[PDB]
């Protein structure tokens, strides 16, 4: 329920994410390729949030930071879907 990780194979329900707009809502409205997105987890209804603790605690000025999921919703964390052309 915390600390998003990478799983090797992905048909399980533990890797299903669902997303809701920051702006006005919609039931089916053709997500327009650049909108801001808040990520909601499915198997445990929990919202992603940016933890400030570092992954690597051994070397100074650490480049690796952690992320987590917290069960209350806020507008601090809202990932953007910026695309790359083929």
């Amino acid at each position: 329920v915390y600390s998003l990780v990478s799983v090797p194979e992905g048909n399980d329900i533990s890797s299903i994410f669902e997303l809701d707009p920051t702006t006005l809502r919609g039931g089916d409205s053709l997500v327009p390729r650049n909108s801001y997105v808040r990520l909601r987890h499915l198997c445990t209804n929990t919202w992603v949030h940016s933890t400030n603790i570092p992954i690597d605690k051994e070397e100074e000025k650490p480049v690796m930071l952690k992320i987590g999921t917290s069960p209350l919703k806020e507008d601090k964390e809202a990932f953007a879907i910026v695309p790359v052309s083929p």
Binding site: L30, V31, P32, R33, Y36, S50, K76, E77, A78, F79, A80, I81, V82, P83, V84, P86
Partner: protein, 48 residues
């Protein structure tokens, strides 16, 4: 006939022997517009 450099591979020829090519849909027409988040896109995930 398997390829020699790649072990799990097979050649595609154009000989007279019969084969069936089943059409498996992945993306219907009019879902291939560039202004829509599609099911095969590559994206990078910027925090706000």
């Amino acid at each position: 006939h398997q390829l020699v450099d790649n072990p799990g591979c097979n050649e595609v020829n154009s000989v007279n022997c019969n084969t069936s090519w089943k059409i498996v849909l992945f993306m219907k027409w009019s879902d291939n517009k560039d202004d829509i988040l599609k099911g095969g896109d590559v994206v990078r995930l910027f925090h706000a």
